[PDB]
Design a protein around this nucleic acid. Sequence first.
DNA 1: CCCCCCCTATCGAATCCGTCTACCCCCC
Length: 151
Amino acid sequence: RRIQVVHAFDIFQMLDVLQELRGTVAQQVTGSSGTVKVVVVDSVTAVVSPLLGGQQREGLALMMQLARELKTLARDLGMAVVVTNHITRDRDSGRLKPALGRSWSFVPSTRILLDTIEGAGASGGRRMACLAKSSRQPTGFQEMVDIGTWG
DNA sequence: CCCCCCCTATCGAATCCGTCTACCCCCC
């Protein structure tokens, strides 16, 4: 009962939900309990992916505004925000890189690139976890995480 | 001028290599 879930399938719905959260927590400054401390977005790419494409510019502005409001929320109100994303071209010219282009790369503070192992030991919960960007510690370290036997 | 993003199977070819023997009949 302490885990609250809301469905948003368009960027306007997500913006409205986050603005409502900001307003409610601003009104709840007096209170000391019941205020959410962790905010999780299941997929920020799926909502904004249809808005990209073409030679227009409103999609980039919308995603930048969403990033700015997320950053203001997390900084001002001391919340931990976690979002997900997808990968882009794996061809020879372009390495495995996060989606949403170059402009989104400056938004987050920490990047964790989940991956699957190949050959022996594949399948199951065996996934390789790496830290791409942290801006606080050396990067490029690979570890192992099991989910099938975890919880 | 500048932005972000992907595809799909095909044909047929080319012969080699010999083993094993059995079984007697009839008087002036």
